[PDB]
Amino acid sequence: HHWGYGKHNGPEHWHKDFPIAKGERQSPVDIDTHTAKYDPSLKPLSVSYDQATSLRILNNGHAFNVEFDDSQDKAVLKGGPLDGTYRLIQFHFHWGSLDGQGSEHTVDKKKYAAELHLVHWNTKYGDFGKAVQQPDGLAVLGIFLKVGSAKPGLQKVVDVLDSIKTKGKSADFTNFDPRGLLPESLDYWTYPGSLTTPPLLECVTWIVLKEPISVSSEQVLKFRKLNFNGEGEPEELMVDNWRPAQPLKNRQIKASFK
Ligand SMILES: NS(=O)(=O)OCCCCCCCCOS(N)(=O)=O
Ligand SMILES: [Cl-]
Ligand SMILES: [Zn+2]
């Protein structure tokens, strides 16, 4: 057996193999907009994805990862609450079976249809492996997805999903520009958290954008055609691969805007 999002291996079961699931800085969390406080110490956020080099897209049995070449400082995230440079390594999404759910973070308890996670690691630690052994090893830029108008920049991702329907399948995915997945505004909320999937390591500085991007019903419907299962096995649609909000505990969510 292995962790997943089913009734028998879902979020409520994770703590048995990953005790940190009940830790002090777990993610995601509900973002109470009225309790979040504007933080003047936050520096301007810098998303520099101009030289991003995508390589492959993979169905890992939980979601699909668009992987990037992080052997050189190309796609980096800096500024904001971040100290130093964080390099983009991959991005993936979390989505629901219906438009009314799918996101991991929530805003005033509101759930979006999906959530995009752009994962970056602190270059001061040399590699991703070492970074996840540090309290400030990672920075994940989270972007909410709502259903409405199509997102042109997402279509290339959608059209390749048919080739990676099942767990373990991958496909070349070069020259994809992640800048086409960003909303207009970079206003955000930030707080110290963790990976939202096992191992649930608490090494993440979360930066969640306030402005969601709009994707079409057709685009998200194709996300829902993916499979959690591997080839030749009974079909288990890849839907609702999101972890619910976790206790905030000793943390404050800061806003980059007034
Ligand atoms: N949803 S999230 O963005 O918070 O996180 C997803 C998992 C990200 C990958 C985590 C892999 C952890 C194992 O790293 S290792 N082998 O030790 O280098
Ligand atoms: Cl199921
Ligand atoms: Zn994620």
PDB file of C-alpha atoms and ligand atoms in Angstrom:
ATOM      1  CA  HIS A   1       0.000   0.000   0.000  1.00  0.00           C
ATOM      2  CA  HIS A   2       0.943   3.664  -0.356  1.00  0.00           C
ATOM      3  CA  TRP A   3      -0.416   7.051   0.663  1.00  0.00           C
ATOM      4  CA  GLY A   4      -3.013   8.637  -1.572  1.00  0.00           C
ATOM      5  CA  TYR A   5      -6.312  10.493  -1.492  1.00  0.00           C
ATOM      6  CA  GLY A   6      -8.745   7.609  -1.145  1.00  0.00           C
ATOM      7  CA  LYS A   7     -10.864   6.809   1.907  1.00  0.00           C
ATOM      8  CA  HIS A   8      -8.345   4.202   3.040  1.00  0.00           C
ATOM      9  CA  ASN A   9      -5.062   5.987   2.304  1.00  0.00           C
ATOM     10  CA  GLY A  10      -6.064   9.652   2.297  1.00  0.00           C
ATOM     11  CA  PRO A  11      -5.108  12.718   4.424  1.00  0.00           C
ATOM     12  CA  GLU A  12      -6.624  11.300   7.622  1.00  0.00           C
ATOM     13  CA  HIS A  13      -4.312   8.276   7.372  1.00  0.00           C
ATOM     14  CA  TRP A  14      -1.024  10.010   6.567  1.00  0.00           C
ATOM     15  CA  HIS A  15       0.008  10.635  10.181  1.00  0.00           C
ATOM     16  CA  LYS A  16       0.548   6.907  10.753  1.00  0.00           C
ATOM     17  CA  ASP A  17       3.540   6.791   8.408  1.00  0.00           C
ATOM     18  CA  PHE A  18       4.338  10.510   8.497  1.00  0.00           C
ATOM     19  CA  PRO A  19       3.816  11.671  12.114  1.00  0.00           C
ATOM     20  CA  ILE A  20       4.768  15.237  11.167  1.00  0.00           C
ATOM     21  CA  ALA A  21       1.277  15.357   9.624  1.00  0.00           C
ATOM     22  CA  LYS A  22       0.199  16.636  13.056  1.00  0.00           C
ATOM     23  CA  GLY A  23       3.138  19.037  13.309  1.00  0.00           C
ATOM     24  CA  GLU A  24       3.380  22.703  14.255  1.00  0.00           C
ATOM     25  CA  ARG A  25       3.671  24.179  10.751  1.00  0.00           C
ATOM     26  CA  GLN A  26       1.592  22.022   8.426  1.00  0.00           C
ATOM     27  CA  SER A  27       0.052  23.120   5.124  1.00  0.00           C
ATOM     28  CA  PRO A  28      -2.282  24.022   3.606  1.00  0.00           C
ATOM     29  CA  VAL A  29      -4.192  26.404   5.863  1.00  0.00           C
ATOM     30  CA  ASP A  30      -7.250  28.596   5.614  1.00  0.00           C
ATOM     31  CA  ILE A  31      -6.274  32.183   4.903  1.00  0.00           C
ATOM     32  CA  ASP A  32      -8.490  34.419   7.012  1.00  0.00           C
ATOM     33  CA  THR A  33      -8.186  37.685   5.087  1.00  0.00           C
ATOM     34  CA  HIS A  34      -9.307  39.840   7.994  1.00  0.00           C
ATOM     35  CA  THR A  35      -6.732  38.343  10.359  1.00  0.00           C
ATOM     36  CA  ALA A  36      -3.875  38.518   7.840  1.00  0.00           C
ATOM     37  CA  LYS A  37      -1.775  41.640   8.380  1.00  0.00           C
ATOM     38  CA  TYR A  38       0.006  43.836   5.846  1.00  0.00           C
ATOM     39  CA  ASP A  39       3.752  43.507   6.389  1.00  0.00           C
ATOM     40  CA  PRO A  40       5.888  46.534   5.411  1.00  0.00           C
ATOM     41  CA  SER A  41       9.104  44.545   5.900  1.00  0.00           C
ATOM     42  CA  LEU A  42       8.249  42.448   2.844  1.00  0.00           C
ATOM     43  CA  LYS A  43      10.409  43.331  -0.155  1.00  0.00           C
ATOM     44  CA  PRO A  44       9.062  43.390  -3.720  1.00  0.00           C
ATOM     45  CA  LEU A  45       8.452  39.858  -5.011  1.00  0.00           C
ATOM     46  CA  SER A  46      10.546  38.887  -8.024  1.00  0.00           C
ATOM     47  CA  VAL A  47       9.462  36.092 -10.355  1.00  0.00           C
ATOM     48  CA  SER A  48      12.135  35.655 -13.033  1.00  0.00           C
ATOM     49  CA  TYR A  49      11.055  32.822 -15.331  1.00  0.00           C
ATOM     50  CA  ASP A  50      12.420  34.245 -18.603  1.00  0.00           C
ATOM     51  CA  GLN A  51      15.116  31.567 -18.976  1.00  0.00           C
ATOM     52  CA  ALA A  52      13.009  28.694 -17.629  1.00  0.00           C
ATOM     53  CA  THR A  53      13.857  25.352 -19.226  1.00  0.00           C
ATOM     54  CA  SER A  54      11.117  22.737 -18.921  1.00  0.00           C
ATOM     55  CA  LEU A  55      12.106  19.149 -19.640  1.00  0.00           C
ATOM     56  CA  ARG A  56       9.400  16.598 -19.023  1.00  0.00           C
ATOM     57  CA  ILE A  57       5.890  16.080 -17.688  1.00  0.00           C
ATOM     58  CA  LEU A  58       5.173  13.117 -15.417  1.00  0.00           C
ATOM     59  CA  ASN A  59       2.114  11.402 -13.957  1.00  0.00           C
ATOM     60  CA  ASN A  60       3.397  10.286 -10.539  1.00  0.00           C
ATOM     61  CA  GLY A  61       0.161   8.644  -9.422  1.00  0.00           C
ATOM     62  CA  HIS A  62      -0.858  11.659  -7.349  1.00  0.00           C
ATOM     63  CA  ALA A  63      -0.737  14.576  -9.789  1.00  0.00           C
ATOM     64  CA  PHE A  64       1.396  15.470 -12.796  1.00  0.00           C
ATOM     65  CA  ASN A  65       4.705  17.302 -12.557  1.00  0.00           C
ATOM     66  CA  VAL A  66       6.147  19.607 -15.191  1.00  0.00           C
ATOM     67  CA  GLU A  67       9.871  19.341 -14.443  1.00  0.00           C
ATOM     68  CA  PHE A  68      12.528  21.978 -15.073  1.00  0.00           C
ATOM     69  CA  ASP A  69      16.286  21.948 -15.539  1.00  0.00           C
ATOM     70  CA  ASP A  70      17.512  23.401 -12.240  1.00  0.00           C
ATOM     71  CA  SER A  71      21.234  22.805 -12.823  1.00  0.00           C
ATOM     72  CA  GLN A  72      21.705  26.520 -13.552  1.00  0.00           C
ATOM     73  CA  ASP A  73      20.031  29.610 -12.116  1.00  0.00           C
ATOM     74  CA  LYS A  74      17.364  30.241 -14.752  1.00  0.00           C
ATOM     75  CA  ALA A  75      13.870  30.209 -13.296  1.00  0.00           C
ATOM     76  CA  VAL A  76      14.190  31.851  -9.899  1.00  0.00           C
ATOM     77  CA  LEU A  77      11.991  33.383  -7.239  1.00  0.00           C
ATOM     78  CA  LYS A  78      13.346  36.018  -4.857  1.00  0.00           C
ATOM     79  CA  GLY A  79      12.227  39.028  -2.854  1.00  0.00           C
ATOM     80  CA  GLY A  80       9.039  39.130  -0.829  1.00  0.00           C
ATOM     81  CA  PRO A  81       9.605  37.228   2.452  1.00  0.00           C
ATOM     82  CA  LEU A  82      12.496  35.331   0.882  1.00  0.00           C
ATOM     83  CA  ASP A  83      16.131  35.593   1.879  1.00  0.00           C
ATOM     84  CA  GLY A  84      18.278  34.728  -1.115  1.00  0.00           C
ATOM     85  CA  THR A  85      17.505  32.906  -4.355  1.00  0.00           C
ATOM     86  CA  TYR A  86      15.080  30.025  -4.862  1.00  0.00           C
ATOM     87  CA  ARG A  87      15.309  27.961  -8.043  1.00  0.00           C
ATOM     88  CA  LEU A  88      12.260  26.520  -9.813  1.00  0.00           C
ATOM     89  CA  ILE A  89      12.346  22.720  -9.991  1.00  0.00           C
ATOM     90  CA  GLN A  90       8.790  21.732 -10.948  1.00  0.00           C
ATOM     91  CA  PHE A  91       5.151  22.704 -10.844  1.00  0.00           C
ATOM     92  CA  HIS A  92       1.967  20.688 -10.431  1.00  0.00           C
ATOM     93  CA  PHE A  93      -1.680  21.167  -9.551  1.00  0.00           C
ATOM     94  CA  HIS A  94      -4.264  19.949  -7.062  1.00  0.00           C
ATOM     95  CA  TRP A  95      -7.860  19.806  -8.272  1.00  0.00           C
ATOM     96  CA  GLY A  96     -11.315  18.514  -7.471  1.00  0.00           C
ATOM     97  CA  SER A  97     -13.971  16.259  -8.950  1.00  0.00           C
ATOM     98  CA  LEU A  98     -16.281  19.297  -9.104  1.00  0.00           C
ATOM     99  CA  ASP A  99     -15.613  23.023  -9.614  1.00  0.00           C
ATOM    100  CA  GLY A 100     -16.606  23.720  -6.008  1.00  0.00           C
ATOM    101  CA  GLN A 101     -13.493  22.114  -4.547  1.00  0.00           C
ATOM    102  CA  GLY A 102      -9.919  21.293  -5.437  1.00  0.00           C
ATOM    103  CA  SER A 103      -7.676  23.911  -3.871  1.00  0.00           C
ATOM    104  CA  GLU A 104      -5.617  23.162  -0.782  1.00  0.00           C
ATOM    105  CA  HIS A 105      -5.367  26.638   0.669  1.00  0.00           C
ATOM    106  CA  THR A 106      -8.723  28.314   1.152  1.00  0.00           C
ATOM    107  CA  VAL A 107      -9.582  31.998   1.429  1.00  0.00           C
ATOM    108  CA  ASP A 108     -12.077  32.801   4.175  1.00  0.00           C
ATOM    109  CA  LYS A 109     -12.981  29.119   3.876  1.00  0.00           C
ATOM    110  CA  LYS A 110     -13.653  29.472   0.141  1.00  0.00           C
ATOM    111  CA  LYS A 111     -12.385  26.571  -1.941  1.00  0.00           C
ATOM    112  CA  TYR A 112     -11.232  27.184  -5.513  1.00  0.00           C
ATOM    113  CA  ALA A 113     -11.504  24.649  -8.352  1.00  0.00           C
ATOM    114  CA  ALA A 114      -7.776  23.966  -8.283  1.00  0.00           C
ATOM    115  CA  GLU A 115      -4.409  25.223  -7.110  1.00  0.00           C
ATOM    116  CA  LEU A 116      -1.107  25.541  -8.945  1.00  0.00           C
ATOM    117  CA  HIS A 117       2.136  24.964  -7.035  1.00  0.00           C
ATOM    118  CA  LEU A 118       5.453  26.189  -8.415  1.00  0.00           C
ATOM    119  CA  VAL A 119       8.135  24.546  -6.267  1.00  0.00           C
ATOM    120  CA  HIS A 120      11.498  26.234  -5.658  1.00  0.00           C
ATOM    121  CA  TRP A 121      14.510  25.347  -3.518  1.00  0.00           C
ATOM    122  CA  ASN A 122      16.918  27.679  -1.716  1.00  0.00           C
ATOM    123  CA  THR A 123      20.169  27.667  -3.687  1.00  0.00           C
ATOM    124  CA  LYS A 124      22.250  28.229  -0.548  1.00  0.00           C
ATOM    125  CA  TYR A 125      21.706  24.519   0.160  1.00  0.00           C
ATOM    126  CA  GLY A 126      23.131  23.164  -3.089  1.00  0.00           C
ATOM    127  CA  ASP A 127      20.370  20.736  -4.058  1.00  0.00           C
ATOM    128  CA  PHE A 128      16.711  19.995  -3.428  1.00  0.00           C
ATOM    129  CA  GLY A 129      17.565  17.032  -1.212  1.00  0.00           C
ATOM    130  CA  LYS A 130      19.604  19.144   1.184  1.00  0.00           C
ATOM    131  CA  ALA A 131      17.087  21.978   1.021  1.00  0.00           C
ATOM    132  CA  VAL A 132      14.312  19.793   2.433  1.00  0.00           C
ATOM    133  CA  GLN A 133      16.364  19.315   5.596  1.00  0.00           C
ATOM    134  CA  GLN A 134      16.231  23.057   6.293  1.00  0.00           C
ATOM    135  CA  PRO A 135      13.513  25.276   7.814  1.00  0.00           C
ATOM    136  CA  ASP A 136      13.862  27.711   4.897  1.00  0.00           C
ATOM    137  CA  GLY A 137      14.789  25.209   2.224  1.00  0.00           C
ATOM    138  CA  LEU A 138      11.785  25.664  -0.046  1.00  0.00           C
ATOM    139  CA  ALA A 139       9.467  28.320  -1.405  1.00  0.00           C
ATOM    140  CA  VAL A 140       6.234  27.340  -3.113  1.00  0.00           C
ATOM    141  CA  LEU A 141       4.293  29.890  -5.112  1.00  0.00           C
ATOM    142  CA  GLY A 142       0.633  28.974  -4.955  1.00  0.00           C
ATOM    143  CA  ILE A 143      -1.913  30.190  -7.479  1.00  0.00           C
ATOM    144  CA  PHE A 144      -5.653  29.572  -7.324  1.00  0.00           C
ATOM    145  CA  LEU A 145      -7.631  28.455 -10.364  1.00  0.00           C
ATOM    146  CA  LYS A 146     -11.275  29.338 -10.891  1.00  0.00           C
ATOM    147  CA  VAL A 147     -13.473  28.147 -13.747  1.00  0.00           C
ATOM    148  CA  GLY A 148     -14.386  30.743 -16.353  1.00  0.00           C
ATOM    149  CA  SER A 149     -12.436  31.889 -19.396  1.00  0.00           C
ATOM    150  CA  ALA A 150      -9.710  29.588 -20.707  1.00  0.00           C
ATOM    151  CA  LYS A 151      -6.071  30.187 -19.779  1.00  0.00           C
ATOM    152  CA  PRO A 152      -4.184  30.220 -23.116  1.00  0.00           C
ATOM    153  CA  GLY A 153      -0.851  29.468 -21.469  1.00  0.00           C
ATOM    154  CA  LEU A 154      -2.221  26.289 -19.894  1.00  0.00           C
ATOM    155  CA  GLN A 155      -3.477  24.625 -23.079  1.00  0.00           C
ATOM    156  CA  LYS A 156      -0.132  23.062 -23.993  1.00  0.00           C
ATOM    157  CA  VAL A 157      -0.187  21.297 -20.622  1.00  0.00           C
ATOM    158  CA  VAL A 158      -3.769  20.159 -21.163  1.00  0.00           C
ATOM    159  CA  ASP A 159      -3.088  18.752 -24.630  1.00  0.00           C
ATOM    160  CA  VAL A 160      -0.235  16.518 -23.474  1.00  0.00           C
ATOM    161  CA  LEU A 161      -2.183  14.899 -20.629  1.00  0.00           C
ATOM    162  CA  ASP A 162      -3.563  12.241 -22.972  1.00  0.00           C
ATOM    163  CA  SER A 163      -0.031  10.868 -23.320  1.00  0.00           C
ATOM    164  CA  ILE A 164       0.501  10.515 -19.555  1.00  0.00           C
ATOM    165  CA  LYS A 165      -2.907   9.215 -18.506  1.00  0.00           C
ATOM    166  CA  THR A 166      -1.576   6.651 -16.043  1.00  0.00           C
ATOM    167  CA  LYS A 167       0.845   6.461 -13.120  1.00  0.00           C
ATOM    168  CA  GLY A 168       4.472   6.221 -14.198  1.00  0.00           C
ATOM    169  CA  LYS A 169       3.972   7.667 -17.669  1.00  0.00           C
ATOM    170  CA  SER A 170       6.053  10.643 -18.762  1.00  0.00           C
ATOM    171  CA  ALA A 171       6.498  12.688 -21.925  1.00  0.00           C
ATOM    172  CA  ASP A 172       9.037  15.166 -23.222  1.00  0.00           C
ATOM    173  CA  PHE A 173       7.817  18.660 -22.381  1.00  0.00           C
ATOM    174  CA  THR A 174      10.385  21.199 -23.481  1.00  0.00           C
ATOM    175  CA  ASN A 175      10.034  24.911 -24.120  1.00  0.00           C
ATOM    176  CA  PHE A 176       7.021  25.421 -21.868  1.00  0.00           C
ATOM    177  CA  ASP A 177       6.928  28.967 -20.467  1.00  0.00           C
ATOM    178  CA  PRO A 178       5.492  29.016 -16.916  1.00  0.00           C
ATOM    179  CA  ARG A 179       4.985  32.785 -17.131  1.00  0.00           C
ATOM    180  CA  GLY A 180       1.766  32.024 -18.992  1.00  0.00           C
ATOM    181  CA  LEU A 181       0.248  30.563 -15.824  1.00  0.00           C
ATOM    182  CA  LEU A 182       0.582  33.709 -13.717  1.00  0.00           C
ATOM    183  CA  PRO A 183      -2.223  36.175 -12.974  1.00  0.00           C
ATOM    184  CA  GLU A 184      -1.768  39.916 -13.529  1.00  0.00           C
ATOM    185  CA  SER A 185      -1.156  40.871  -9.904  1.00  0.00           C
ATOM    186  CA  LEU A 186       1.549  39.509  -7.621  1.00  0.00           C
ATOM    187  CA  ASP A 187      -0.228  40.550  -4.414  1.00  0.00           C
ATOM    188  CA  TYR A 188       0.141  37.668  -1.970  1.00  0.00           C
ATOM    189  CA  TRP A 189      -0.164  36.185   1.498  1.00  0.00           C
ATOM    190  CA  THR A 190       2.787  34.404   3.045  1.00  0.00           C
ATOM    191  CA  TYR A 191       3.380  32.108   5.999  1.00  0.00           C
ATOM    192  CA  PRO A 192       5.772  29.313   7.073  1.00  0.00           C
ATOM    193  CA  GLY A 193       4.475  25.867   6.240  1.00  0.00           C
ATOM    194  CA  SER A 194       5.132  22.431   4.821  1.00  0.00           C
ATOM    195  CA  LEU A 195       4.817  20.218   1.788  1.00  0.00           C
ATOM    196  CA  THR A 196       1.128  19.336   1.454  1.00  0.00           C
ATOM    197  CA  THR A 197       1.889  15.753   0.424  1.00  0.00           C
ATOM    198  CA  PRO A 198       3.936  13.152   2.291  1.00  0.00           C
ATOM    199  CA  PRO A 199       6.683  13.465   3.491  1.00  0.00           C
ATOM    200  CA  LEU A 200       4.941  16.678   4.665  1.00  0.00           C
ATOM    201  CA  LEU A 201       8.319  18.237   5.490  1.00  0.00           C
ATOM    202  CA  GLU A 202       8.151  21.622   7.211  1.00  0.00           C
ATOM    203  CA  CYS A 203      10.632  23.519   5.028  1.00  0.00           C
ATOM    204  CA  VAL A 204       8.345  25.744   3.018  1.00  0.00           C
ATOM    205  CA  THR A 205       7.837  29.473   2.889  1.00  0.00           C
ATOM    206  CA  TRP A 206       4.431  29.704   1.257  1.00  0.00           C
ATOM    207  CA  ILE A 207       3.610  32.556  -1.087  1.00  0.00           C
ATOM    208  CA  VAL A 208      -0.040  32.369  -2.154  1.00  0.00           C
ATOM    209  CA  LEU A 209      -1.210  34.854  -4.769  1.00  0.00           C
ATOM    210  CA  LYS A 210      -4.474  36.644  -4.049  1.00  0.00           C
ATOM    211  CA  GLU A 211      -5.560  36.887  -7.681  1.00  0.00           C
ATOM    212  CA  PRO A 212      -6.699  33.549  -9.117  1.00  0.00           C
ATOM    213  CA  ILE A 213      -6.225  32.666 -12.762  1.00  0.00           C
ATOM    214  CA  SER A 214      -9.218  31.600 -14.816  1.00  0.00           C
ATOM    215  CA  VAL A 215      -9.209  28.296 -16.678  1.00  0.00           C
ATOM    216  CA  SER A 216     -12.043  26.912 -18.786  1.00  0.00           C
ATOM    217  CA  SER A 217     -14.338  24.072 -17.773  1.00  0.00           C
ATOM    218  CA  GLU A 218     -12.921  22.127 -20.717  1.00  0.00           C
ATOM    219  CA  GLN A 219      -9.368  22.544 -19.426  1.00  0.00           C
ATOM    220  CA  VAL A 220     -10.095  21.344 -15.887  1.00  0.00           C
ATOM    221  CA  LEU A 221     -12.305  18.546 -17.216  1.00  0.00           C
ATOM    222  CA  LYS A 222      -9.228  17.172 -18.964  1.00  0.00           C
ATOM    223  CA  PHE A 223      -7.295  17.279 -15.673  1.00  0.00           C
ATOM    224  CA  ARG A 224     -10.048  15.014 -14.318  1.00  0.00           C
ATOM    225  CA  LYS A 225      -9.498  12.444 -17.070  1.00  0.00           C
ATOM    226  CA  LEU A 226      -6.072  11.510 -15.730  1.00  0.00           C
ATOM    227  CA  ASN A 227      -5.678   8.309 -13.714  1.00  0.00           C
ATOM    228  CA  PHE A 228      -4.258   7.613 -10.238  1.00  0.00           C
ATOM    229  CA  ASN A 229      -3.773   4.017 -11.377  1.00  0.00           C
ATOM    230  CA  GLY A 230      -1.088   2.618 -13.633  1.00  0.00           C
ATOM    231  CA  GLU A 231      -1.601   1.244 -17.137  1.00  0.00           C
ATOM    232  CA  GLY A 232      -3.658  -1.939 -17.370  1.00  0.00           C
ATOM    233  CA  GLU A 233      -5.274  -1.418 -13.968  1.00  0.00           C
ATOM    234  CA  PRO A 234      -8.904  -0.517 -13.134  1.00  0.00           C
ATOM    235  CA  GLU A 235      -9.528   3.178 -13.693  1.00  0.00           C
ATOM    236  CA  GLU A 236      -9.451   5.506 -10.700  1.00  0.00           C
ATOM    237  CA  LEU A 237      -9.907   9.057 -11.948  1.00  0.00           C
ATOM    238  CA  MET A 238      -7.282  11.478 -10.698  1.00  0.00           C
ATOM    239  CA  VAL A 239      -9.561  13.915  -8.891  1.00  0.00           C
ATOM    240  CA  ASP A 240      -9.658  15.490  -5.439  1.00  0.00           C
ATOM    241  CA  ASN A 241      -5.917  15.159  -4.950  1.00  0.00           C
ATOM    242  CA  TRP A 242      -5.916  17.928  -2.351  1.00  0.00           C
ATOM    243  CA  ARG A 243      -5.197  17.984   1.376  1.00  0.00           C
ATOM    244  CA  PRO A 244      -7.659  19.993   3.506  1.00  0.00           C
ATOM    245  CA  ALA A 245      -6.755  23.004   5.641  1.00  0.00           C
ATOM    246  CA  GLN A 246      -4.625  22.224   8.704  1.00  0.00           C
ATOM    247  CA  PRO A 247      -4.417  23.939  12.113  1.00  0.00           C
ATOM    248  CA  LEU A 248      -2.680  27.334  11.952  1.00  0.00           C
ATOM    249  CA  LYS A 249      -1.135  26.996  15.493  1.00  0.00           C
ATOM    250  CA  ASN A 250       1.580  29.363  16.279  1.00  0.00           C
ATOM    251  CA  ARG A 251       1.589  31.223  12.929  1.00  0.00           C
ATOM    252  CA  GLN A 252       0.603  34.544  11.403  1.00  0.00           C
ATOM    253  CA  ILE A 253      -0.249  35.056   7.769  1.00  0.00           C
ATOM    254  CA  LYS A 254       1.231  38.253   6.343  1.00  0.00           C
ATOM    255  CA  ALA A 255      -0.116  40.201   3.369  1.00  0.00           C
ATOM    256  CA  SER A 256       2.050  41.975   0.789  1.00  0.00           C
ATOM    257  CA  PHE A 257      -0.703  44.543   0.209  1.00  0.00           C
ATOM    258  CA  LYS A 258      -2.771  47.015   2.224  1.00  0.00           C
TER     259      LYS A 258
HETATM  260  N1  LIG B   1       2.169  20.231  -2.639  1.00  0.00           N
HETATM  261  S1  LIG B   1       3.605  20.786  -2.335  1.00  0.00           S
HETATM  262  O1  LIG B   1       4.022  21.631  -3.405  1.00  0.00           O
HETATM  263  O2  LIG B   1       3.626  21.279  -0.990  1.00  0.00           O
HETATM  264  O3  LIG B   1       4.635  19.595  -2.331  1.00  0.00           O
HETATM  265  C1  LIG B   1       4.483  18.553  -3.374  1.00  0.00           C
HETATM  266  C2  LIG B   1       5.645  17.613  -3.243  1.00  0.00           C
HETATM  267  C3  LIG B   1       6.972  18.215  -3.623  1.00  0.00           C
HETATM  268  C4  LIG B   1       8.111  17.227  -3.653  1.00  0.00           C
HETATM  269  C5  LIG B   1       8.527  16.717  -2.300  1.00  0.00           C
HETATM  270  C6  LIG B   1       9.445  15.533  -2.348  1.00  0.00           C
HETATM  271  C7  LIG B   1      10.084  15.218  -1.023  1.00  0.00           C
HETATM  272  C8  LIG B   1      11.247  14.271  -1.114  1.00  0.00           C
HETATM  273  O4  LIG B   1      12.430  15.069  -1.506  1.00  0.00           O
HETATM  274  S2  LIG B   1      13.833  14.349  -1.561  1.00  0.00           S
HETATM  275  N2  LIG B   1      13.684  12.973  -2.311  1.00  0.00           N
HETATM  276  O5  LIG B   1      14.175  14.095  -0.195  1.00  0.00           O
HETATM  277  O6  LIG B   1      14.646  15.210  -2.359  1.00  0.00           O
HETATM  278 CL    CL B   2     -11.734   5.979  -4.631  1.00  0.00          CL
HETATM  279 ZN    ZN B   3       1.253  20.851  -4.309  1.00  0.00          ZN
END
